């Protein structure tokens, strides 16, 4: 019968109370978000700086509980240098009655691409960063997991430009959708894993030019911006649309041809423009996969096939379809926390 597990101490971080194991010291506020908040801390077992995410009221609803469970399972499953992973998971709770939240411990990353975007990117820096993005995507895709909301704010980077993908596998009024694939925005055919490769294309274009590639105040406005770049698609593509109205709209447009991408991107190398052309492709069956993109000459200076690993096993969340009670989800989560091993 306890207030918290032995070896836990209570401390305020960013004016909220955290409960941490003795082994994590000097907690320092990093940020507050939609599902929790993050601090940095020193693991006195090594002196390594780590990030700790405190989940905020994950058991407030079945929705939040389910997301918390899936996130924990996803982070545990993936084992790849360019995919954010878990060093540790803990809760101060001593029982289910006491179980209100838990904490994820992760490699500390200084910043993210959104924060350093606009700063000047040599093509070498773009090669390096995009290569790492694509290795991470190859890996999660190979486990049957897509990101679906890849954007610069989800790409963590450190001082050495090492990169890790955040917030994968967890995907109104007018939220920004600048990096989302057209087939997702318009739901005009079913998407495959290359939805994320569209996003890579958008992010790479922005690193090249300094400007967001596509914006728009509504979906049709954004589509108009996209077609300025892709050209109005022809017969092979149009036949694949499952939205009759969208098809008719496309067939009724001024039928403006695509590219030249070396003209659209006047400062890009031929290999950069060629890769962009193959990622910013409306046809989801022709768009490059991550594995294919990694073989492109743009990455020749950095390519190491040995680093381009696949997940040995598919991500398997049996309870993904299940509708359980918060108490039931708690037990599942509670169990998953105990079983963890670094």
CATH number of the structural domain spanning residue 28: 3.30.200.20
Q: Are 24 and 7 in contact (CB under 8 A)?
A: no
121 and 87 in one domain?
no
The CA distance from 9 to 52, in Å, is: 15
Last residue of a domain, one of 110, 139, 174: 110
Long-range Cβ contacts of 296-301 (<8 Å, 24+ apart): 296/271, 297/271, 298/127, 298/130, 298/269, 298/271, 298/272, 298/274, 299/127, 299/130, 299/131, 299/134, 301/124, 301/127
**Residues 184 and 157 placed together within one structural domain of the fold:** yes
**Closest to 20 measured CA to CA, from 1, 47, 42, 46:** 42
Is 149 among the catalytic positions? yes
* Domain presence at residue 337: no
Q: Which residue has the tokens 């696949």?
A: 310
Q: Which of 99, 95, 78, 105 is nearest to 23 (CA)?
A: 105
List the catalytic residue out of 149, 196, 304, 317.
149
Instruction: Locate 308 and state its tokens.
Output: 């381009």
Nearest to 106 by CA among 170, 59, 39: 39
Q: Are residues 138 and 101 in the same domain?
A: no
Flag whether 325 is in a domain. Answer: no
- 327 domain-assigned: no
DSSP secondary structure, 157-169, as one string? E-TT--EEE-STT
206 and 131: one domain?
A: yes
Domain assignment of residue 322, yes or no: no
CA 312 vs. chain centroid, Å, equals 20
- Helix or strand run (H / E) with residue 133: helix 123-142
Position 223 in a domain: yes
Dihedral sign (CA 16, 25, 47, 100): negative
Q: Which of 59, 80, 110 is the last residue of a domain?
A: 110
Strands 88-90 and 103-107: antiparallel
Instruction: Clarify whether residues 52 and 197 are in a common domain.
Output: no
For 192, 270, 320, 323, 328, the CA distances from 66, given in Å and listed in that order, are 24, 46, 8, 9, 10
93-103 burial, b if ≥16 CB within 10 A, otherwise e? beeeeebbbbb
Domain range spanning residue 48?
18-110
Question: Are 251 and 158 contained in the same domain?
Answer: yes
Residues 6+ apart with CB under 8 A from 294: 131, 134, 135, 138, 303, 308
Cα–Cα distance measured from residue 296 to residue 303, given in angstroms and rounded to the nearest whole number: 9
- CATH code where residue 241 lies: 1.10.510.10
Please tell me whether residues 155 and 192 are part of one structural domain. Answer: yes
Q: Which of 96, 103, 83 has its CA nearest to residue 41?
A: 103
Residue 46 burial (10 A CB sphere; 0-12, 13-18, 19+): exposed
In a domain? residue 205: yes
| Angle 319-168-154 from CA coordinates, rounded to 5° | 155
Q: Solved by what technique?
A: X-ray
| 336 assigned to some structural domain | no
Cβ neighbours around 184 below 10 Å, total: 16
**How many independent structural domains does the chain possess?**
2
Instruction: For residue 332, tell me if it sits in a domain.
Output: no
Same domain for 243 and 193, yes or no, is: yes
Which residues are annotated as part of the binding site for ATP?
30-38, 53
Residues 52 and 73 in one domain: yes
Radius of gyration of the chain (CA): 22
- Are both 275 and 299 inside the same structural domain? yes
Indicate the residue among 110, 139, 162 that finishes a domain.
110
* 214 and 306 within one domain: yes
Are 281 and 135 in the same domain? yes
Phi and psi at 17, nearest 5°, equal -80, 125
CB 45 within 8 A of CB 111: no
């Amino acid at each position: 019968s306890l207030i918290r597990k032995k070896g836990f101490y209570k401390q305020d971080v960013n004016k909220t109370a955290w409960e941490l194991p003795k082994t994590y010291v000097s907690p320092t506020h990093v940020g507050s978000g939609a599902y929790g908040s993050v601090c940095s801390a020193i693991d006195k077992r090594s002196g390594e700086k780590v990030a700790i995410k405190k989940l905020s009221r994950p058991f407030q609803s079945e929705i939040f509980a389910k997301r918390a469970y899936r996130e924990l399972l996803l982070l545990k499953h993936m084992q790849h240098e360019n995919v954010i992973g878990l060093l540790d998971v803990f809760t101060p709770a001593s029982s289910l009655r006491n179980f209100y939240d838990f904490y994820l411990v992760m490699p500390f990353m200084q910043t993210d691409l959104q924060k350093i975007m606009g700063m000047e990117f040599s093509e070498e820096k773009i090669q390096y960063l995009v290569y790492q993005m694509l290795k991470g995507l190859k890996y999660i895709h190979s486990a049957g997991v897509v990101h679906r909301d890849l954007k610069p704010g989800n790409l963590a980077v450190n001082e050495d430009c090492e990169l890790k993908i955040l917030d994968f596998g967890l995907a109104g009024y007018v939220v920004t959708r600048w990096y989302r694939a057209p087939e997702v925005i318009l739901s005009w055919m079913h998407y495959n894993q290359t939805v994320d490769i569209w996003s890579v294309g958008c992010i790479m274009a922005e690193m090249l030019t300094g400007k967001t590639l596509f914006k728009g105040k509504d979906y049709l406005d954004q589509l108009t911006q996209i077609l300025k770049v892709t050209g109005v698609p022809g017969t092979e593509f149009v036949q694949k649309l499952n939205d009759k109205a969208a098809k008719s709209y496309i067939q009724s447009l001024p039928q403006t041809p695509r590219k030249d991408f070396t003209q659209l991107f006047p400062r890009a190398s031929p290999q950069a423009a060629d890769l962009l052309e193959k990622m910013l492709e409306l046809d989801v069956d022709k768009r490059l996969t991550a594995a294919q993109a990694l073989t492109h000459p743009f990455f020749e200076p950095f390519r190491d096939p040995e680093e381009e690993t696949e997940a040995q096993q598919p991500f398997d969340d049996s309870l993904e379809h299940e509708k359980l009670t918060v108490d039931e989800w708690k037990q599942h989560i509670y169990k998953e926390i105990v079983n963890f091993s670094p």
